Ligand binder design. Structure first.
Ligand code: POV
Ligand code: POV
Ligand code: POV
Ligand code: POV
Ligand code: POV
Ligand code: POV
Ligand code: CLR
Ligand code: CLR
Ligand code: CLR
Ligand code: CLR
Ligand code: CLR
Ligand code: CLR
Lengths: 196, 196, 196, 196, 196, 196
């Protein structure tokens, strides 16, 4: 493994991306992948097993955990990464297909599809940011929550596992997503300006 | 690892597949594999260990879990992926075998076997969709289930683990399967139209 | 990794195998390996930890589990795969050795050893099918078993984990083994017919 | 894998780094990675599961663990490694991009960006050292802690897991970080002296 | 990965080994490695956690398990494999060193060192077989054991986990070791006969 | 992977090491790595979870385990391996750097740095042997220990997990370390004798 191969793999074979989406976006993507890898198994490993409520009612822990955590942060970020990386994979596959068909026997089409893929990537980033805002208002996570879902009688106190570490990693991931959004907007603006 | 090698591996050495089954089907397959990888161990890891029923009867948890989950969603999707990818593997092996035998010493046969493999892939997709509909009517998963299987006395309340996250991943996987079905039908129609 | 390398590795360097044992047997072997990988850790992971009996007698769970599951299905299938793949490994090593010794300085010997290896593979398949029939009569697995082994007093009710999913995977593996047996018999018959 | 490839990968393709940041910094980075790998899963694997307090109050263990360990040492060191390695990754990607753009169709710019990246690496090292000092004053870790956080009544005695082994690994990691800081300062001074 | 590379790696670069130690010994070594891999984590994974004794005395389970299992079968077989494979590694390293020193600037020495390594391998096999016989007389493993070690009062009944599956794997490993011993003796005899 | 590449990687590109540190030291290093890999997860996996004391005092198990095992044998051996392998890594990186700088545009310096690295390796081996002697006097490990650390009242009996298997692996690792020390001393003596 060399740098001239890793850089080519990350950037794809596309020849229209500038240094914003070729040197900086790949680094932020690697940063997000590494943070998700080092945080998924350890911090969020025992989010449900150590989630306890102050009650004797059977089945209250599971219903309260599902009520307060419809989908954990780790899985939300994994889905966000997959959806954000899908258009880049599509562009790389399209470039490879065009190269194959021209070998066995265009610039504007590649430029347009790259612009469309960057727009879709920005849209996915914004959609996942909005979903995270809807599900979990506020970056901070609290230690104690009040759960009144059936079958729990009245309201019970349930305790979250590692609120502070999860808050730190949430801040990191949200900052990375914001940087990605800014870089995508800058890339779109730069391409439009240079094309005109 | 380069893009011109990954694309060749995903598309095989077949020269009859169009851009529908060469650029889009491979991307959807990668998407399904990644979602299954990020959801199998985490979301469905403790589906049975944290499945509890409100009873003192020994052995009621296991019989109720088997009654309500004959085969978990993760294993159903893994089997679906294996069966769907089997015809592509067969086509790739047949192409390699034909290349080997012509090297040590046809187009219509390859075209027909590719069409048959795509038809079988579509059939497997439809069969697994129908099986999922039969076993689990409705995408949504409920928190509480009523289990009256022996040895549980009368009817007991059993609680499912992470209904909402499993519902989200079920929606994702079903949408991906539907997209695969549509793409396979489009590929078959395109091949038939172009052949005539 | 390319297709022309994977196909060569799976088929070996043998030049006597026809398309039955070169295109179809390898695919079925890959199918069995993938099914075993996706079923070994998940379905059979907690076969003993969640095996409970309705008694207060210490040590009854372990003796009952050993009585009813002398060797689990996953380990039986792993041993079957290893024993079935051993003759192919022997043939590949013999071909490599012959190539090496002819390089540093025959067809009938290779043909005979390939026929013998296919016969041994068929014999191993049949032996493991018969062993599975002896140990576990019937593909279906029951939820409740009656265990009267010492030290359990009288007869106790013990509950198996995931009978239905294990039944489904047993059906899959038995069908794959039967297909392998049929393909091996067809390969032997084809070789004998073509040699005469 | 050979030495001339591993050395090139670790040093990047940059031609301005001297032997301080090319022979010694890479070795210390490998040392830190290996220590973190051998200490993360074993020593810090059960930091929360075996963290017990001398009370009957539900939820006191989790709140006390979060109070005394806002973010564990392993995750702090992983984040420190990622942030420290980010500027080197940026420099390598920039060098690859410059090589690509000069191939498809400068020294001062590379020198300045390398100096800036080394300065940022030193700044990140210092910031993480200061954060570790703020969160955990003193290298030594105590066996018993006094926790008076809600809902724990009055003050409870909580017991930390493996204080001595964690102290040893903390000493190792802090010494490695100090060596990295000294090497970065020496590299900056050497570059400035040689440039003038 | 091809067959001509795997065969060369398994056989080393030694030019004195015949087909007994080049085609058959490597296959048996691969068989032993695969069986150990598929049996180490599953069958022997919970040998101590599910080892229970019929007593209320604290610490009796651990002392009884250590009394009856001084070193588990899996670790004994792993050590046996490592010690048996050490002389082959030494021979390969010596051949590589001789090739390097002759490149930068004998047959009898290589023949003698290969014979000595085969003798040492046979000696290690015999020693480990004798150790296994001393520690565990008889291939069969019993469900119930009588433990009278301090602090257990009088004699307690302790129950072993999966006696039958462990017996099956013990039979497999002992048969493989016996085959290895026979092949090593045959190789030594063949070399001595051909040398004279 | 071939032997001529593995041997080159293990020996580095250094041209001053004799057969003692090129054929035998690498084999012993591989032996130690393999033993540590096969013993770390299995034997020492549950050293603390199954460490129980005969008392009702909360938190006595953790304090007693930390008192009697300040740092486990596995982590001590891992740190010893890392520290022993550090000078070899430094020498390899220095050789690669010298090759790079001579390519883009000495024997005594390489000889001296190799001698210094071997001396440092011997010093690290001796230091870790002395540390192991200080922490754990005697190779044998006892089943029962007497713990009188706060908060345990008076003196309690605590039971160690797998004393005999840990004793066996301790003997193996200590013998390997002694062999490494002897080989390093022999290498230093041989180099000094041949240089004069
Ligand atoms: C389904 C699960 C997915 C999970 C998410 C994965 C996401 C991220 C994962 C992966 C992204 C890729 C990472 C490495 C990229 C570098 C490639 C490279 O430099 O290639 C170059 C060198 O490389 C080689 O010659 C060897 C290539 C080895 C790549 C890694 C192999 C698999 C790693 C498995 C890891 C297992 C652990 C992974 C997790 C279990 C190409 O060779 P070259 O000589 O340059 O070519 C000719 C030269 N010329 C072009 C000038 C003519
Ligand atoms: C049984 C369990 C199965 C599980 C499901 C697996 C399903 C998915 C898994 C795998 C699908 C394949 C993934 C990688 C595909 C890219 C290949 C590629 O680009 O090859 C190219 C580069 O590549 C190389 O030179 C190195 C090839 C490394 C591939 C990965 C090695 C194993 C990874 C193990 C991962 C471990 C973790 C996996 C999970 C434990 C080919 O080389 P080239 O130089 O281009 O060729 C000559 C050039 N010319 C042709 C122009 C003349
Ligand atoms: C002990 C445990 C065993 C478990 C059961 C294993 C059973 C199944 C496992 C393995 C079976 C083999 C799988 C891959 C086969 C494809 C090989 C191939 O295509 O080679 C080709 C390309 O390939 C390369 O250049 C790179 C080869 C990488 C192969 C994978 C590396 C290890 C994966 C580790 C995975 C880790 C996870 C595994 C589980 C932990 C050969 O190269 P080429 O350029 O074509 O050659 C020259 C070209 N010419 C010939 C035309 C002149
Ligand atoms: C997302 C998770 C990240 C975790 C943190 C990772 C951080 C650290 C990880 C990785 C850093 C890299 C480690 C190896 C670097 C050596 C490369 C090398 O020497 O290349 C050379 C040889 O190499 C080859 O030909 C094969 C390259 C294989 C590299 C490893 C493959 C993936 C390993 C997966 C590991 C799985 C386990 C990992 C953990 C799951 C290049 O080839 P060459 O012939 O020299 O080139 C032509 C020669 N010429 C230039 C003179 C013309
Ligand atoms: C410390 C833990 C140890 C555990 C015990 C291990 C014991 C057993 C383990 C390993 C034994 C070796 C297994 C593979 C051997 C095949 C090699 C081969 O065919 O090479 C050939 C092809 O190969 C390649 O080009 C790629 C080589 C990839 C080998 C696997 C990489 C690492 C797998 C990691 C696995 C991860 C999972 C492992 C467990 C975590 C050589 O190339 P070639 O083109 O033929 O050369 C030039 C051609 N010419 C010579 C004609 C001129
Ligand atoms: C951070 C965690 C660290 C843990 C401790 C690690 C310590 C030990 C680990 C690693 C030490 C190295 C082991 C293999 C060494 C053999 C290399 C070799 O023979 O190269 C040769 C062949 O090789 C190839 O062509 C492929 C190289 C694959 C090496 C393994 C890849 C990553 C394995 C990942 C394993 C995953 C599991 C690991 C654990 C998760 C070089 O190629 P060549 O064709 O000879 O070169 C040209 C020929 N010529 C020179 C004559 C011109
Ligand atoms: C500018 C940024 C966003 C570019 C990022 C490139 C991403 C999207 C690309 C680069 C290399 C790609 C990987 C290359 C190879 C494989 C192996 C295959 O079996 C599954 C997909 C997977 C794992 C790809 C996923 C997508 C991937 C990570
Ligand atoms: C158009 C779409 C459906 C094409 C998808 C291609 C799929 C079916 C192919 C492409 C590469 C293939 C893999 C290549 C190599 C191996 C290693 C082998 O030991 C097991 C099978 C396995 C893991 C193959 C499984 C099938 C596979 C994933
Ligand atoms: C026609 C069908 C049955 C052919 C199947 C081929 C099988 C038997 C062959 C093809 C490739 C082989 C593998 C190639 C390389 C290795 C790595 C080695 O360290 C252990 C054995 C192992 C894992 C081999 C096991 C046997 C294997 C899987
Ligand atoms: C002077 C010192 C600091 C140099 C250290 C070099 C570091 C920063 C470089 C060298 C090789 C790099 C790795 C090379 C390849 C990959 C695979 C990719 O999928 C994720 C990033 C990752 C894992 C890189 C991370 C950063 C890395 C480890
Ligand atoms: C005739 C029979 C006994 C020959 C068997 C060959 C054995 C002893 C050889 C062949 C290939 C070798 C392996 C090749 C590469 C490595 C990687 C290295 O980092 C650790 C050692 C290890 C894992 C070797 C161990 C010994 C090994 C498995
Ligand atoms: C004579 C004896 C002591 C020589 C032993 C050589 C040792 C020290 C060398 C040989 C090959 C080296 C490895 C080669 C590649 C890597 C990958 C890198 O990402 C981390 C370091 C690591 C894992 C190296 C560690 C040190 C290493 C194992």
């Amino acid at each position: 493994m060399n740098w001239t191969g890793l850089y080519t793999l990350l950037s794809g074979v596309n020849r229209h991306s500038t240094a914003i989406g070729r040197v900086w976006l790949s680094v932020i993507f690697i940063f997000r992948i590494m943070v998700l890898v080092v945080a998924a198994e350890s911090v969020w490993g025992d989010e449900k097993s150590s989630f306890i409520c102050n009650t004797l009612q059977p089945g209250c822990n599971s219903v309260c955990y599902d009520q307060f955590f419809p989908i954990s942060h780790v899985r939300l970020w994994s889905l966000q990464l997959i959806l954000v990386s899908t258009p880049a994979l599509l562009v790389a596959m399209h470039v490879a297909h065009q190269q194959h068909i021209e070998k066995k026997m265009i610039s504007g089409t590649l430029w347009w599809t790259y612009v469309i893929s960057v727009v879709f990537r920005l849209l996915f980033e914004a959609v996942f940011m909005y979903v995270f805002y809807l599900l979990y208002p506020g970056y901070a996570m609290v230690r104690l929550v009040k759960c009144d879902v059936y079958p729990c009688p009245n309201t019970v106190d349930c305790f979250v596992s590692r609120p502070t570490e999860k808050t730190v990693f949430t801040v990191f991931m949200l900052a990375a997503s914001g940087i990605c959004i800014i870089l995508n907007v800058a890339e779109v603006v730069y391409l439009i300006i240079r094309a005109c």
